[PDB]
Chain length 296, copies 4
């Protein structure tokens, strides 16, 4: 019912999406948008079958998995809940959407097990969030972050120094898993289904599978709202007012709660590290359809 009021006519709605997508082209030239509604209707326009690495787009997914498997109380002994590297007053990374927090979050998953298993455990949730659609792995990107990710090594050693990891966790193992998860590949199409799972309270809308808890989803959407677009997060919360997560790949994972998930891809980044076209497209779509979280 709520969905029906927000999008009465799907074909008409996709027509407007296409028009905005087109306008935004007035900005390689990779440009794609896919969406998946909470009742499983789909639309892609442009370059939506090209694989690309999740990179930071994975941060809310791993956080949601940690909450789903361990609960809020425990997770947030190790990572904070608000916008900010550095550490906060309690001596922990500010939130799960900044690198230091995402690294700590990564360390929390299946602490009793090895590298291969941790990865496979996360991957099983990601597969289900995507309704078993396209999910790959870029060894090129993985090896590149391993060899050149000095910023993350610096953060890792700092977290270790400040005692920010759970007992018995090897810092280097946690970094290795974090780099692996950043190297998972999706397309706009599969990514949109993941975002739709978050839009749909943690149930994958193309399979009906329960993937994440309501608590995990609520927490994740809250932190995406406030921390999901790096230095542009405040502007985005004000003008667009929806949970989103950006990445250096030029991806934007956007959630419209109880309506749809979307994944946009356009590699060229603005000064704040967010897709120039993706961001502009979100603003135009939300203004036109009154999807802002505080639209009446």
């Amino acid at each position: 019912l709520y969905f029906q009021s927000m999008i009465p006519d799907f074909e008409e709605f996709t027509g407007h999406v296409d028009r905005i997508f087109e306008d935004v082209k007035e900005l390689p030239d990779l440009w794609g948008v896919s969406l998946c509604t909470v009742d499983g209707q789909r639309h892609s326009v442009g370059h939506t079958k090209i694989p690309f690495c999740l990179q930071s787009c994975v941060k809310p997914l791993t956080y949601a998995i940690s909450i789903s498997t361990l609960g809020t109380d425990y997770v947030h002994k190790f990572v904070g809940k608000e916008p900010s590297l550095s550490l906060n007053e309690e001596g922990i990374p500010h939130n799960p959407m900044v690198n230091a927090g995402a690294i700590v979050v990564s360390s929390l998953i299946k602490m009793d097990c090895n590298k291969a298993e941790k990865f496979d455990f996360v991957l099983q949730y990601l597969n289900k969030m995507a309704g078993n659609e396209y999910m790959g792995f870029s060894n090129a990107t993985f090896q590149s972050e391993k060899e050149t990710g000095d910023r993350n090594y610096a953060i890792g050693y700092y977290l270790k120094e400040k005692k920010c990891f759970p007992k018995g966790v090897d810092m280097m193992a946690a970094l290795d898993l974090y780099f692996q998860l950043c190297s998972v590949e999706v397309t706009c199409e599969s990514g949109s289904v993941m975002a739709a799972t978050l839009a749909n309270g943690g149930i994958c809308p193309i399979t009906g599978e329960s993937v994440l808890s309501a608590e995990a989803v609520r927490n994740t959407l809250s932190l995406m709202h406030s921390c999901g677009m790096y230095d542009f997060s405040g502007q985005f919360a004000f003008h667009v007012g929806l949970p989103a997560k950006s990445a250096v790949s030029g991806a934007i994972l956007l959630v419209v709660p109880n309506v749809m998930g979307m994944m946009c891809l356009s590699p060229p980044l603005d000064k704040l590290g967010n897709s120039h076209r993706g961001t502009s497209f979100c603003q135009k779509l939300v203004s036109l359809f009154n999807f802002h979280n505080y639209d009446n």
Copy 2:
């Protein structure tokens, strides 16, 4: 329809409100700011909650007809008036749109947002710039009256004179804003402070405050009068900034656990908006360390978590 799903049964809902109100009485911690024992506003046991739904249903429990000064609760109201009369583009040349950091100016040389004192002082200055002191006040008071559906609205001259004589923090901010050139042309800093102190001294009750909060919950239309008070744009902006900046240093925790637009004040008030459902005003003077009502905050957390009112609840 949407309201019906969020609150299927009003009477049953008010029954839960009453019970939580009662449970929260067990909480006695916190310190009252600017305690004057003769004054009802300083009573640590003052405790009241009122609400007004977007379709005009009402419920009060406890001390809901005791007047108290809006103080910081006026910040989002004056902001909403400025946007409604001048538009986003113009207002936000003079004030920012985001949280500051647990005060200063931002990268563009302007106060971080309308919910911190420096931003609220600038926002005060923007209203009816071509007119005099009396008229600015009356123009704001007319919007406030209408937001409250013409229910109780007073003025505390004692509070006004007290802030004038001892509000050193705000004078420091005022001179700093002047030094950094943060005010519009033709504005006298001292006049803008004077107006800000006046607006902070406007009095409401839980009941009249709840209606102001309901006007925000209802897209800018006062639900007990049908009047179009604020533009939709004004309300949307206001609710966004209340969500992220409305509870001072507790704003992050509140956004995470409660997930609603709220504004706290040193009076121990909490103006809470549940969009498309209701406005609520809670009052309990004893403050926790971050300056927010110990009981009010606890009550909001319990009510919102029981009823799934968090903005991102499924």
Copy 3:
């Protein structure tokens, strides 16, 4: 004896001073340098009889007077001792050379008395530091700081809010005195004698009068060394290595301990608010004569 080794031949020394003064002209066009040795020898070149307001150059003088009359222990309950507005860990202005500290310092002087008397009490020390040479007052500058000094009013109200003043002190009275003292006028010639008093352990070298205590002078020279040139203080300490104080008037009060005091005037300021020519002249003079505090 020590002076004799540092400057064996005064006439030869002044000849080099003149040559540097001249070189620096390759930079109104007000430009003057005066010096006064600790044994009372004098040299001026350029515009050394033009009065100008001490402004910030007064900050170390008022601080020295406070120490001389009240002692270190007491003064430094209210003001800190190191480079940094804001307040420090103990809730007090960082040092006497920043505005907030200079304002608090001003408040400490003759607390039991009125405006006129406070001023006259400070003025009696300043007169004696200058060996009774030129000392005036600019009402233009005083009224201008009163009407336009919003930064200082902001600081004043902040100090009052944070309870940084001694008991019973009216903040506005303290600001008024601080603005008055900033408006005291000297020439390069009279100013050089003040600086020579500091170079000579607190005895005015043209009169033999004991003006300030050894403790006051030592403290003052220490803080001038580290805090006396605003954001350029670290560079200056490293390359020049002498106690100096700059002001917005384009003045530089320079002390060469046990050798001489100097006052330079050149109104055009660099980006950090210090006289472009004055600063350059200090660097060249010190490199040539090996006057750096850590020169062997």
Copy 4:
């Protein structure tokens, strides 16, 4: 002549040194860092002071022949070597010249100064860039030997291996410097860390350390050998930065009350320079809250104030 005025009578001077050394034994507060009870360096009662005048007179009292690792005391020595071999202009493209703030990079994107770990790591990297690990070490060790007039100089492999295995703070700094591109061309970050950890593990005694400090007091000429070890420019820079950055967060207090170039270390050492008079090395392991020797600092304050050695004493 200048020396004669500062210390008119050597024997009388050493007598006062001895008495202050004795008085300071009453101070037992402080905490020993990285306490290993088998190791002499961890003994809270380890207490020694040696000095060497610029004309080569010597005095030791207490535990002055116990080796200990230079740790941070090596920072100003490696810096002085870099300036002496490469010059100010070149070195200070890679490291700043001033105190940081009670860690990060400065406005120009470089470590704040050579006395903080990040600056000392970069300074390490600058030395003999065209050569290998063994040679860099030996080249620095040769200057250190000469600064110490060929007196005691050792190496603790236990300390070196310990920092390699558990120095997480320094690895974090190292990767950050690499990320921000703070090293010269051709330098491997890990090699520079390894060298820095090696130099920190070089051992001296109070006696040999005092001579190194005397070389700095004497314009770069080792006073017990007459050898020209460091350039005048190197020494002047080094003493300036020790004055302002040498005692971590206590540097301001120390500059104000003591007014001399000094460098503290986590070992409880204090290398103190009295220019044109003497070098001194004090050792007492228990540290105050800011990481400086509780007894050493107190002893320096008492000695300097009694003898008027403050740089701005008249």
